[PDB]
Structure formats: structure tokens, C-alpha cells
Design a protein around this ligand. Sequence first.
Ligand SMILES: Cc1cc2nc3c(=O)[nH]c(=O)nc-3n(C[C@H](O)[C@H](O)[C@H](O)COP(=O)(O)OP(=O)(O)OC[C@H]3O[C@@H](n4cnc5c(N)ncnc54)[C@H](O)[C@@H]3O)c2cc1C
Ligand SMILES: [Hg+2]
Ligand SMILES: [Hg+2]
Ligand SMILES: [Hg+2]
Length: 647
Amino acid sequence: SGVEGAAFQSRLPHDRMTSQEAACFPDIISGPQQTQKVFLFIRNRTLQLWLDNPKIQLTFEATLQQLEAPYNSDTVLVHRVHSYLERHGLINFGIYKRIKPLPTKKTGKVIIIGSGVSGLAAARQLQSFGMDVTLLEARDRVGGRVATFRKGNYVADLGAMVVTGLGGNPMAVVSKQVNMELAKIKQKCPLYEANGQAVPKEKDEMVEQEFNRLLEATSYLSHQLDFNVLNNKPVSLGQALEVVIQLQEKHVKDEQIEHWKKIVKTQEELKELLNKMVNLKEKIKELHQQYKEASTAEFLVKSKHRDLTALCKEYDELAETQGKLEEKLQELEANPPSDVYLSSRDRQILDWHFANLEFANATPLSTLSLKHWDQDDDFEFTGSHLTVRNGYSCVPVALAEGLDIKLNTAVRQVRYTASGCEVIAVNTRSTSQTFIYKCDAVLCTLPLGVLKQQPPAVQFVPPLPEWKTSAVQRMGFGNLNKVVLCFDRVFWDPSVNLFGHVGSTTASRGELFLFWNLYKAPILLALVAGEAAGIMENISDDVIVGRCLAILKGIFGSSAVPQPKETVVSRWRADPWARGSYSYVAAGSSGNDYDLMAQPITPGIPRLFFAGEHTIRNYPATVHGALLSGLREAGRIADQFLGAMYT
Ligand SMILES: Cc1cc2nc3c(=O)[nH]c(=O)nc-3n(C[C@H](O)[C@H](O)[C@H](O)COP(=O)(O)OP(=O)(O)OC[C@H]3O[C@@H](n4cnc5c(N)ncnc54)[C@H](O)[C@@H]3O)c2cc1C
Ligand SMILES: [Hg+2]
Ligand SMILES: [Hg+2]
Ligand SMILES: [Hg+2]
């Protein structure tokens, strides 16, 4: 119904109790039988109230004076539940019209490094929780990896772009709090070969099926044959993909020989029978004559014929088998089995499919861990993916509308004593060059690519533990850029949301393999994935944009493709503040390292906390994952520097 709906939108079992909820309400409800029944209801009921209007602060009081006959009778458990929820950011999170103003007297000082979605997400929580929160963004703007290009009437989105489902997506709440227009993505997508050729629907279907076919084989080798460690080395997805393919290439060369074989075993039978026949032609030739000339004419001529009968008559089975066989020799030479697994043209189309996976996981397929690159799948939201029409930057800007964000300052050192901790940052685009932030706790929102920067970029007085950094280095941070093309008008099909360009070579199959049309203005978004992404980051926007034009008027109008009025090209590897797209499970790593990343570090009570895209295990590499990780720490921190929820 409706109350049980909210539970789902909150990623919570409706009739069950979270491992967490169990803890905060220790048998106080995990004791009797039908007393928890009530509990859960009071939970879902609130979850519902909040969700039905996340543009306002859902008060304990408001929650109370809105419950049914029983429930609101026991005023105490309600509060218990409400606080619990409000603490974990299941209600009153994001940006809402606050009732009951913040406490002028804040408690504790928290320094949050970076102001990405996880940063802002956390910030606000803590703020609301009644704490002193200051964000140090080293980038003249908020939103980090949610970067939107805004020039005149054009809107682009070089960072996050898609909102993958609204089924249990916290982003569904934020999205309506901010009044951000989302739009569904037309699945239809046509593939144009490296010539413009639209690729016949049937070929596109066979190959794509053979893609899903291959990929699933891969899954079998992994989860059914434990083909995860070959030669004390970790198996990568791409490694396995190449195994399965090579195996189907085997079946082909195989049933190819079973054929050639029996064609020959028959060619030999006719030749072995032709001799038997040519040899019988003599016997029926030597006799046939001694018959006519010796036609002695008593019981003799009566027999030469009895003889010639048998011979001419046995010469029938031969000439009869000959045909039979001689003709079956055609049921073979006339119907060969497939001579090749995939045509050179096929593979290229197949590669596009690979590139499309590389685009998703933001890393060459070779880099992926055969066993865990899927690991998070069990939590994907329900409902179709949407595009933001007015620019994703809405969310972050909106979310920053009330906190003190120390922009343009770059944290280059983090100190943490058993007691307080110091943060030293530098300024860059404003008269300064050295600051020092003293505070109780540090919330690190630094992207995995930065924590990986060799040099490195930021230092941690007591160095980060063994376990930590070793996890940081074995995880994966990928890359993937975009090529924005602002035009004079639409020269492409308006009812199509996306179309692909088949690549030339397996390597560089990700080179501008997918154009994207999602806006009002005449604007296409070109994608560079796979190993092409990093390399391409070394070319002029001009040259890159030129390769786009070709492919374009190559598939469209005979040079009936205008000159882009405007143009942008992203380079996330280079961005010193990002160092790549987002994480991915690399061969050797696993879903555990995401957990170790969340792990707070305590000096020789905890000081250093981490959040961000690379911190959240079942929602990595996403904006909602970042936001959830954000809320998570915000809560965790306030449980130590304030108190823990009871029942
Ligand atoms: C091309 C591309 C496409 C994507 N598409 C999607 C998509 O469709 N959907 C989706 O859900 N996700 C997508 N993502 C990823 C998503 O945007 C990120 O996962 C998310 O923004 C990460 O959140 P974060 O809070 O960790 O912040 P950022 O990743 O926002 O990280 C922290 C912030 O700190 C700043 N900072 C860095 N170094 C320092 C320093 N030394 N001192 C101080 N501040 C510093 C950064 O500039 C940044 O603002 C995409 C990413 C890329 C690159
Ligand atoms: Hg397509
Ligand atoms: Hg197979
Ligand atoms: Hg906005």
C-alpha cells in the first residue's frame, strides 16, 4: 500500500527490522511479539509522512499529531522512532523548509574536506544536528564531480548526468525538493558503422545477443567454476571475455572439421566404389561377349544368361548406392557449417558493446575484477533512468544554500591528535597562501583518485594506517570524458535520445562511440570511454571536435553538419581535484575495500572520518551513493560527539 511503500523508498524491509534498527532498539522491541509490529508501523508511517512532502521539516510533534487512533497514544516510542530516523537521515535530509530554527549555540567543530555531493550532504546534516561545520573546497565552486556547463541558453553536464531509477532512490527526494526536471531516456539507439551504414536491425540483434551471451558465460566461469585466480593472478572480466570468445572460436573450428571430415570419408567411398564398379564392368564385359559369340547352346546359353543376370543385377546396387552417396556428397558440399565465429564487421559491432560496458564501469574491461565488478547489482533502483533537463548542478548549488563553504582553499595537510586535529590548507585564486583549521573531527570527502595521487597531494600527520592505504591502492579509479557540441539547430533525429558510432579498432572502440541528445538546444554530447578516454585527453578540443564532425556528417548529411557554435571537452584524469571519473572494482579488490574506506581512523575517540563515492559499498560510483555516504558519516559523527539513540 502506501505506508509499506515508504519503507521501500527508504531502502528498508517493511515487515522486518534492520540490523541497525535492532541495535538502537535493543530487544526493547526485539523482545515481545506484537509490540514491534507497532514499531515498524510507526517507522513506515513517518517514512511516509516525510516522503510525501520532503520540502518541510517533519517534526516529532508534526509526526505525533498525525498518527492514527492507537499509535499516537504512546507518545514516547514515537519520539524514539523519530529521533532514530532523523539521525540516520531517512527523514529531514537534503534541503527543506526548516521549522524550529537551528541552535545558535553550536557544539563541536567539524572540518569537511571538499564540497561534493557527499560533502554538502554531510554538512547540512551536521549543521541541522547543531554543530559547527566548515567545508574547505579547493575548487572555486561546489558540486565537485557534478559539474554543469552553463553558457547563455545552453546547459551541458560534464559530470554526473543520469539519475538511475527513482525506486528507493534518495535522489528522488532531493530532486523534488530542488524542483529539478528529470526526463526518461528513450531506449531506442541505432548503430552506425564506421561509414554511416545504419547496421541492419538483424545484425544489431544477433551481435547484441551474442554480447549478452558471452557476458553470461563469463558469469558462469566465475560463480560456478570458480575461475577467479589463474596463475596466482586475479582474473579480470576482459580476461574471461577473451576466454569464452576463444572457446566459441573453437566450437566453430571444431564442427568445421567434423564436416570437412565426413565430406572426405564419402569422397573416398565413391572412389572406392567406382573401382568396384569399373571392376564389375569387366566381368560383365568378358561374359557379355562370350555370351554373344558362344551363343554349347544347350544348357549353356541358358546359363551364360543366368550368369549375366546376377552380374548385371548386382551392378544395380552399386549404381544405386553410387547415386544415393554421390548425391549425399552434395548435402555436404552444399551446406557448409559457419566458417567463422564473427565477421570482422561483427566483432567491431560487438566491440561497441564492450565499449558500452567500459563506458559504464569507466575503465577498460581488462581492469575489472571478473568476480566483483557486479557486486553492487543487488541494489539497483527500480524504474527507468532519467536525464536532468536543467543541469545536474542544481542539486549541489541548492544544497550549499546555507553553510559556510571556504571555497578556493586546498587542504594539503591533515593532523590528528588523540584529542583535536588540525587542517592546514592553502589558498590559490585570492590573496593568501596559508591557513590552519583547528577542529574536533575531519570528514574527508577526497575522491579516490586524489587519495591515490602518488606524490601525494594531501598528507596525514599520523600516516594513514597500513590496512587503509593498502585498500586505497588496490581499489580502482576510472576515467571517461565527454565532448559537448553546441549547434545552430538539430540536424539529427529529435525522437532519438542516443545513437552509437561503431569503432575502427578494438583498442579505441570507446572513441566517441556514443553521441547523446538530451537537451532543448541543438546540442549533442559525445562520449570517450575505455582506454581511449585517457589518451584522448591529450588532444585539442579542435581536433577532438573534428573527429566528431567527421563521424557525424559521416552518418548524417553530406557535410550537411554545421560548425559547432560552442564546444567543451572534459578531462577528468587531468583535473587535479578529481583524477578520473569514479571508482570501480579492480581485479584483486572487492566489495570489502569500499567498507574499509568508510572505516573511521582513531589516533593512538575517532577523529578522521571518510565519505564519498568510493566509501559506499552498495552504491559506489554514483551521486546517490555519495549522498548516502554523506548522510552516513554525518550521523556516525554526531553519535560520538553528541550521544547514541536509545529506546
Ligand atoms: C564523466 C562522469 C560521468 C558521471 N555520470 C554519473 C551519473 O550519470 N550518475 C551518477 O550517479 N554518478 C555519475 N558520476 C559520478 C558522480 O558524479 C560522483 O560519484 C559523485 O559526485 C561523487 O561525490 P563526492 O561527494 O565524492 O564528491 P566530488 O567527487 O564531488 O569529491 C569531493 C570534492 O572535494 C574537492 N577536492 C578535491 N581535492 C581537494 C583538496 N585537496 N582539498 C579540498 N577539496 C578538494 C573536489 O573538487 C570535489 O568538489 C559521473 C562522473 C564522471 C566523471
Ligand atoms: Hg545503440
Ligand atoms: Hg557459451
Ligand atoms: Hg536549480
